[PDB]
Structure 1
Amino acid sequence: SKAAADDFKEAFLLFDRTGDAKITASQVGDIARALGQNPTNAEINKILGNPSKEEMNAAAITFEEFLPMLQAAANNKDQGTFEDFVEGLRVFDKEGNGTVMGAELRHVLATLGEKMTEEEVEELMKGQEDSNGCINYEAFVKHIMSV
């Protein structure tokens, strides 16, 4: 709305590697996340196809399409409730203390639903899981929602 945030246009100049002021359709998922929006990858996929837009063939972009797609994704930020994120992992391990065994969270984050690479899974556990093999998800989900 501007509140006209012109820093979204300045961040589009940091993600366009050619400097022509266009951003390919394959970068739009990760740049919506870098502007403070977390649409799921199936949602980013649907919307695209919904609009008869094929992410399979070469794509370019213009700021005039990327701005309204970020504004259509911005209504879905009401789905980001931290009660359900901590209660999900609290149902994932027994006893009254928030600890996932290391390999349980790593294999679930790579193979269940939207596949996260094991390189990204190791980069998200690095520091929050110590050598006991127990990830405290009270501080883990706190630090994941700090970015």
Structure 2
Amino acid sequence: SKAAADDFKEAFLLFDRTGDAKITASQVGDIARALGQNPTNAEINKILGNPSKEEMNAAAITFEEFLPMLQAAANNKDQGTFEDFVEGLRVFDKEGNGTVMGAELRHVLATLGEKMTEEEVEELMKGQEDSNGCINYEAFVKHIMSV
């Protein structure tokens, strides 16, 4: 709305590697996340196809399509409730203390639903899981929602 945030246009100049002021359709998922929006990858996929837009063939972009797609994704930020994120992992391990065994969270984050690479899974556990093999998800989900 501007509140006209012109820093979204300045961040589009940091993600366009050619400097022509266009951003390919394959970068739009990760740049919506870098502007403070977390649409799921199936949602980013649907919307695209919904608009008869094929992410399979070469794509370019213009700021005039990327701005309204970020504004259509911005209504879905009401789905980001931290009660359900901590209660999900509290149902994932027994006893009254928030600890996932290391390999349980790593294999679930790579193979269940939207596949996260094991390189990204190791980069998200690095520091929050110590050598006991127990990830405290009270501080883990706190630090994941700090970015």
TM-score range for the pair, normalised by the shorter chain length: over 0.9
Number of positions where the alignment pairs a residue of Structure 1 with one of Structure 2? 147
Query: Equivalent residue for 2:31?
Result: 31
1:95-125 residue CA offsets vs partner (Å, 9 max, x unmatched) = 0000000000000000000000000000000
Helix, strand or coil for the counterpart of 2:87? helix
Query: Equivalent residue for 1:77?
Result: 77
Q: Determine if the alignment matches structure 1 residue 46 to structure 2 residue 46.
A: yes
1:26-51 residue CA offsets vs partner (Å, 9 max, x unmatched) = 00000000000000000000000000
Q: Structure 2 CA distance, aligned partners of 1:40 and 1:62? A: 22
| Uncovered stretches (5+) of structure 1, i.e. residues with no partner | none
- CA deviation after TM superposition for structure 1 residue 146, in Å: 0.0
| Uncovered stretches (5+) of structure 2, i.e. residues with no partner | none
TM-score normalised by structure 1 residue count: 1.00
Q: Structure 2 CA distance, aligned partners of 1:70 and 1:25? A: 12
Query: What is the percentage of aligned positions where both structures have the same residue?
Result: 100
TM-score normalised by structure 2 residue count: 1.00
- CA deviation after TM superposition for structure 1 residue 84, in Å: 0.0
Helix, strand or coil for the counterpart of 1:22? coil
Structure 1 residue runs of 4 or more that deviate by more than 2 Å after TM superposition: none
Helix, strand or coil for the counterpart of 2:93? coil
- CA deviation after TM superposition for structure 1 residue 69, in Å: 0.0
Q: Structure 2 CA distance, aligned partners of 1:116 and 1:95? A: 28
